[PDB]
Design a protein around this nucleic acid. Structure first.
Ligand SMILES: [Mg+2]
Ligand SMILES: [Mg+2]
Ligand SMILES: [Mg+2]
Ligand SMILES: [Mg+2]
Ligand SMILES: [Mg+2]
Ligand SMILES: [Mg+2]
Ligand SMILES: [Mg+2]
Ligand SMILES: [Mg+2]
Ligand SMILES: [Mg+2]
Ligand SMILES: [Mg+2]
Ligand SMILES: [Mg+2]
Ligand SMILES: [Mg+2]
Ligand SMILES: [Mg+2]
Ligand SMILES: [Mg+2]
Ligand SMILES: [Mg+2]
Lengths: 544, 544, 544
DNA sequence: TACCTCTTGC
DNA sequence: TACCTCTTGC
DNA sequence: TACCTCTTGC
DNA sequence: TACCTCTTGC
DNA sequence: TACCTCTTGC
DNA sequence: TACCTCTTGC
């Protein structure tokens, strides 16, 4: 009906506790979405070329050359923690849960409204009861997957603030070459956009692949419930590194008086100790020598850019680093860095077009400190001679700033690592898996990776509101009545988690409000707000 | 009952042959265990610091800095081949079995006895019928896993020799930095123990996590039967390397008279041969060029130390090397080296605190001979020019002792390798798997890795035998009656194996006693004994 | 049986989660208890008289005069949080529970052992199998209630440290007068111990009121399960004070730019506002004037000593105070202060007979800041004149240090307050209710007050081990064989709690380990330990 | 509209 | 809303 | 034609 | 206590 | 002795 | 272990 409401606005998060410490977390979210008619009603294949920037020989990393199909459709993406949980709820989950399971997700569009503008510069807004809001749900997942969280373009993080969907667009194949160089490179290094391989051309259109529903004012649209199928995510971090795996050496001499300099001593000549090592050469059995079952973490090339058919790209790392050689200042390769606007956590009363940022440094110790790496000749005659060792200080290729660890890789059959932790609230929640024959062991952008089909994407678009003069036979762009729509969106994301118990004698890490952060969880006198990032795997767990 | 025995001493190994060549090997083991009261009744958090040794710039590999919780409990660990099989039995298994499956493990403590000492320096020993022996079985596996085999601290390998458990202790988190250096490094390289990250603090106590049973003289304690769930272990070695995979080249000319210099010849110009290769450049099809399905083995960095949050540690390798470029003298990276005492195989009548050792060199050929590696320019114009090849002889980073193979890594989607072989008798049998999201494909310390829960650890401790003067309100350490206990331990480890059959025309490798080793399997005139290590995968098997 | 164990040592704390967010917390506790034979086998009625101290006219508060029956029995008291929960468990309860219910309590004595000493000064300890340990359980509650927590004399807080019961003794009626005085009081103020009112004489003996069980070595003793019946205890604190109850005044003018000095203003002359007040005189309606439903908290006389038949005593207060006019330095009347030894949380390696202390300052804001109180003439003509107001600065009785608030009392039919919060670990858990006709609304020493019968007290005593020369007909004290006993105690305290949910947008207070407290939850390198007090009602709750 | 969640529901 | 179609339908 | 035997049989 | 294992058992 | 609690129990 | 007895039993 025209003058009837088709739904409920619910942003309540329910915690249903079940037998055996299981909890069914039901996150409800609703937002008022604002949508304008498309720039143009057509699909465009556009190429982006920032040649003048990558032509500065030393600037390869700043390459932006790519091709894309620009569609007249908008994308309603809610894949981001900030859309479902507020700080308070997040605290509860993170402090008391041990593991989190992604169960299901359903969403609907209701209370649709379409208005038109008519214009001394004074506008007037009216309701066009007959105008339609086009909704398309790509359930089959034909359209290429384009998670908005990667560009901080999801829905708003505050329930009492209207939001908007993002103009949908996807990558169109293109070949491109760009040879790396440095400040002093002589000549002009090849840097060109080759074009398109017809054999890889894929031009998709919502119209030809998805049934489109036309919603008028009294219409609503709901997707069914979609059940995820993916590994659980842990809310505990490991701390043990190869150096803390197994039975420690027996201390034959213990300290007899308190102090920070009163150590205990093993008490056996390093070369007369009993035990096992993988060094068939020496009889030295030290903590750095003793054999460990496998290897926690791995070393990978840092700030390595590889290039294939379409240009260079950063080689991704699984884990960050951090610790007492750390702490958002040294924050090197591996630690994700989120940049975002006012809709997703930046002080809303802040002016200027500079985003808010943060580098997420996980509590899990599975990274590497290259400065501490080194390689020595197999003969293992120590103290090691300069010619018999390769340090992170010895230059590679005559370059003063590149050492071996920079191109080093220790991934292998003995590598053990953990999946990335949830980044509240700017992080992505679930992600689609690659359609390659051999798949990656994890993704660095989300903890949940649908093994099957991921929920299909939801597209919206304001139907063309034609005037009385329309001539399709003409070359000029069609003139439409300025129309826009505002509709309500409601989602329900359901997780299942397990409550934790206390196994150590000591208490553990817990997120808490205090005198220093207190003002990050309350509005200002102007009504300003912000959502500060929070770590997720606070409690520790044994790794072995 | 006080004057009644609660068990049987059985160290018999049963071989039950079943239909279809399957055998149920039941290894029974019993030992008389001796246990003294703890140093102190308290738990201590101790730090070990051998700064003065790692401060010798060239000595990083000798680092021992670590923290550990020292408990008053002792650990009864029987995870080591030497505890269950004698040479004779091992021979049978190794010579006639093809694969070995770890089935179950159960153990019990019986005939408990507690005595007290009382003291011209003449001691007197009495039975304290009321004194108790505390037994705790961490079935849930809350305590961190600390397999004693890694430090040769399991139970004794001879059934007729009393043994003892080891003082239990586990790693306590700590941060620590140590920058590598060499003899001629100028200045003082950072080498410090930072402390502890509260976020990773885990102080466990037997008392707060495991129910403790108090056993008096007439008491016994038995664990139930525990069934393992892990991949089978093979008792055959592969010998084929990439060079021996598939159809050999057809010899167009065969030799016509015996001799070691009368070879056959392929008989087709190397560049006129038919076949397949992954080198799109040349038409050369040689044995080192012809395409093989995948790659057996992989190259990894040798004598590489990586470092994370707690110090440096050796990067582990999956396989050893060996062969005609071998044989316990060159014995380089990958080959495990065991050091051990008299309880585990060293001549028992030997004096001195120097351990017995051996580097285990597996019969499987899946290693690498770096000296034979090399890399050449893609243009493949040969004979190759010096500037177009990188040999294991060309220095990397200006270091005379470091070549590319030293930092090289060829692990990849085409890598194929085998799990580590059993090392009798000093090797560990089963091992717990890491509690990381992505797990290692194997462990280098044991053939069996419980996919589920590994049998929980068994802890023992002599209950405090207080005197009449005890004041808990005091700071001084409590004085106890010198008490100790001797109890009998009996275990039953069950495997299932498959008998082998003869498929080749030639006979194969078999372990056998002869004129040279004969005296390693018999006691001396003094009653000395020893247990010499033995190889396990004697017979060969096709790999492809 | 003599050589058989009669029990299990269990100090595990189980958390059983049920449907609807309820949790059944089962705290198990076991300790090795050490017990010496009594000083004397007789009951003594002793009077304590510290006349010489209270005779210093200004020292009344230091009075210790009292009479007591000294029994040869010892009391095994486990009524104290520290006996049942370690820091880790306490953290879990306090951070995630909303309310706590005391359900049941059962305990047993097992593995009894009796030894005798025999004596160059060298002692020898033997087992006297026939000697008995007397156990008496006053289930009917005939003996006067004497909770040991009040004098920090409960069982030990660490499961791995033997403990001891306390010599039982109870108050014997006595009359006594002591007139207060001050430094300059002239003459000698009456200060005397009158004696005993026969009409109030109550001499109780364990022997005549409780059946006593004789336990020899192979004996055990268990009480049944006892179910408590008392109000639940909340784990949330209220923060609202009369000034924050109800609908705030409507701000007619809001701030327009961020800042800590940009306030909003009500915007209506204080005497032209609409609303309700209990001041029939004026038309002023201010925040301190507007009528509130009732009164949170109450004002009581501070450092008031009252005196009845047996001497002076401090008038107890229900709530503390604290806040930004606070914080363990100003910590005045109402805030409990615990003093204790090494058995209950003081650094165990600390020497000296000085106790460890702390003043518990509750998170609940229900106290008073006298400095802010005042009283003014009913005519309410302001600004108030000196003669028309009585400030906390105006002297009462010509005394410079006493003001009206000192003798002030605002308890009344409109008073609302909360029960005392749990003080971990030194606080008492449950308490017996007074057998008076009109009972107190709460106790200040414990959150749980059994409405019915509280669990009866458990007494122990070493039976007389006579020598061959005993003549009861003699006046001399009987000579006994030096005997002592060590027995194991195990208890099970069960609570039921409700899990909390997140209702605010902001996160809340949570106990957590950090860089500053980290070392309070881990043993030292000497094996030192300590248990630091923790607050219990961290989360806030609405009061109205 | 039920005692700061779903749920005075099941 | 199911794994680029209709169709995780029949 | 079944995972180097008979036997992916019985 | 059975013919050098479990097993003159099942 | 089951996958850091009770509980691979019910 | 039940509300200072036996008896929160009968
Ligand atoms: Mg469909
Ligand atoms: Mg092509
Ligand atoms: Mg850390
Ligand atoms: Mg169990
Ligand atoms: Mg930290
Ligand atoms: Mg070979
Ligand atoms: Mg009774
Ligand atoms: Mg009288
Ligand atoms: Mg406050
Ligand atoms: Mg409700
Ligand atoms: Mg389909
Ligand atoms: Mg076959
Ligand atoms: Mg037989
Ligand atoms: Mg369990
Ligand atoms: Mg009674």
């Amino acid at each position: 009906g025209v003058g009837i409401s088709t739904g409920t606005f619910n942003n309540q998060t329910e915690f249903k506790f079940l037998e055996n410490g299981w909890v069914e977390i039901t996150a409800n979210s609703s937002r008022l979405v604002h949508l304008n008619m498309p720039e143009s009603e057509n699909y465009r294949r556009v190429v982006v070329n920032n040649m003048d920037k990558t032509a500065v020989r030393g600037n390869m990393a700043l390459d932006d050359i790519h091709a894309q199909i620009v569609t007249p459709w908008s994308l309603v993406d809610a894949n981001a923690w900030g859309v479902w949980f507020n700080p308070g709820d997040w605290q509860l989950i993170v402090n008391t849960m041990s593991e989190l399971h992604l169960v299901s997700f359903e969403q609907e569009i209701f209370n649709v409204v379409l208005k038109t503008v008519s214009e001394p510069p004074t506008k007037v807004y009216n309701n066009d009861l007959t105008a339609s809001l086009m909704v398309a749900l790509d359930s089959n997942n034909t359209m290429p997957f384009t998670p908005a969280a990667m560009r901080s373009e999801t829905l708003g993080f505050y329930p009492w603030k209207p939001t908007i969907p993002t103009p949908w667009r996807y990558y169109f194949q293109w070949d491109r070459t760009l040879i790396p160089s440095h400040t002093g490179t002589s000549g002009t290094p090849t840097n060109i956009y080759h074009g398109t391989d017809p054999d890889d051309v894929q031009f998709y259109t919502i119209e030809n692949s998805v049934p489109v529903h036309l919603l008028r004012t009294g219409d609503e649209f709901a997707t069914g419930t979609f059940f995820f199928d993916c590994k659980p995510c842990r809310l505990t971090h490991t701390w043990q590194t190869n150096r803390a795996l197994g039975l420690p050496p027996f201390l034959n001499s213990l300290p007899q008086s308190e102090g920070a300099t009163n150590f205990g001593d093993i008490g056996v000549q390093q070369d007369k100790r009993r035990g096992v090592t993988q060094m068939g050469n020496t009889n030295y059995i030290t903590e750095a020598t003793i054999m460990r079952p496998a290897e926690v973490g791995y070393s990978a090339p840092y700030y390595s850019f590889e290039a294939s058919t379409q240009g260079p790209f950063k080689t991704p790392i699984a884990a960050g680093r951090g610790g007492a050689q750390t702490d958002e200042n040294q924050a090197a390769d591996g630690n994700p860095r989120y940049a975002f606007g006012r809709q997703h956590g930046q002080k809303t009363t802040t002016t200027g077009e500079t985003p808010e940022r943060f580098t997420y440094i996980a509590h899990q110790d599975t990274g590497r400190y290259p400065e501490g790496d080194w390689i020595q000749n197999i003969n293992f005659n120590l103290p090691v001679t300069n010619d018999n060792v390769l340090l992170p200080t010895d230059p590679i290729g005559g370059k003063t700033g590149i050492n071996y660890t920079n191109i080093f890789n220790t991934y292998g059959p003995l590598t053990a690592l953990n999946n990335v932790p949830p980044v509240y609230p700017n992080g992505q929640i679930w992600d689609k898996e690659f359609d390659t024959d051999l798949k990656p062991r994890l993704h660095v952008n989300a903890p949940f990776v649908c093994q099957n089909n991921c929920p299909g994407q939801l597209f919206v678009k304001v139907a063309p509101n034609l005037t009385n003069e329309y001539d399709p036979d003409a070359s000029a762009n069609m003139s439409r009545i300025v129309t826009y729509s505002d509709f309500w969106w409601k989602g329900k994301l359901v997780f299942k988690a397990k409550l934790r118990a206390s196994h150590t004698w000591n208490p553990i890490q817990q997120m808490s409000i205090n005198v220093d952060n207190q003002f990050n969880y309350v509005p200002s006198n102007i009504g300003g707000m912000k959502i500060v990032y929070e770590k997720s795997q606070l409690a520790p767990r044994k790794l072995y």
